[model samples]
Target: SGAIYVGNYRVVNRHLATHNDWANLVWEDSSRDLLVSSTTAQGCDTIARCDCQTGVYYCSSRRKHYPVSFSKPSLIFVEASEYYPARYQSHLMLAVGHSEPGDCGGILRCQHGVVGIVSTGGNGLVGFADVRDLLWLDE
Candidate 1:
């Protein structure tokens, strides 16, 4: 499709799932490979690979190239539901909540179990609203 923004980075699905075996081992530290996923404004799904050790994420459906990271799985929260992944020393999180009539989303940085908001934006329901809306970083 076109271009999508994960925070400020523009990227496309790179099909990082090819290393399914390697990415699957991310949680165990047996592998540094990770499966990264995202959705575009046009409802396109993007898959990419990430390096936990280096904190680099890439998706090459092709774009100008942007830098993304997930030191840990992102924390996704909706108005009535919450999804917290295994704790990591330094990780990024995304939270969705009710802002007006629909929903709003925000980003959080977690370290040693503590969290801090990094950024947030949503056009009514632009953020995550359910478990399925979540895109895994390591898990």
Candidate 2:
């Protein structure tokens, strides 16, 4: 699934050892892709899930220790179309709602202008390869 971070919020994955906790969506400017990570490391250390067609994505880190605190990896979908106009606010709002990764999550499509490049929350429902959203932008 997906989550949107519009503020200066940053999820630290350094001390994460357990599972189902701390996640985010990172927009890598090099790959030109939407990346996702959950309960695992992003980049090349963990399992990565992505869909360039509909802009769906995900990734997983490792569960080292828990019962104390942990940070679930995160993802970032490449829009290349809809333009999400907000960035770096006083507070960020996670569209789907959840801190732990590996949870059923989805993306967020906000219509601000020409529907060129929207944003994916990187959080949605569970058990699906890509974030499931049968609806359209108008909905």
Candidate 3:
């Protein structure tokens, strides 16, 4: 495994999964790892989880408004000083086709009969920030 040693960057997968959307991610897995199945569901809506440890991560979504499959999940990581410009909102909410976050919005959670429940979160496909052509072994 003569993989070059380069710096790492942040990777953010598509936040929204609209209809007819297909996505995937590719990464490196020098250390073999197997991530157990993690699913997010709402009564019936289900979204499979994708691990980032491996070089190839896969998942499928059948949720309405999220017809097409897509690459790995979105990642957002920053240092403390980098979080200087924090915003304050009297009321904040996320939506996916008119659904709350954690719920149908993303993967974290959603509204459930008047309660907020954390939804199943996925890593999407194999994704790495600022690493172009880094994981594409076949490229």
Per-model TM-score on C-alpha atoms: 0.19, 0.17, 0.16
User: In model 2, which range of ten residues has the least summed lDDT?
Assistant: 64-73
Candidate topping TM-score = 1
| lDDT of predicted model 1 | 0.25
For model 3, the run of ten residues with the poorest summed lDDT: 30-39
Residue 88, candidate 3: Cα error in Å is: 19
* C-alpha RMSD for every candidate: 13.8, 16.3, 17.4
lDDT of 1 by residue, 1-139 (tens): 2222333222221212335423333222202112233333243223223222121112122222223332234443423213223333122332232223211222121222112222222442122111112244213
lDDT of all predictions: 0.25, 0.24, 0.22
True lDDT of residue 122, candidate 2: 40
Model 3 regions lying over 4 Å from their true place:
1-65, 77-99, 102-139
**What's the C-alpha lDDT at position 116 in model 1?**
22
> Against the true structure, candidate 2 has what lDDT?
0.24
Candidates, ranked, lDDT? 1, 2, 3
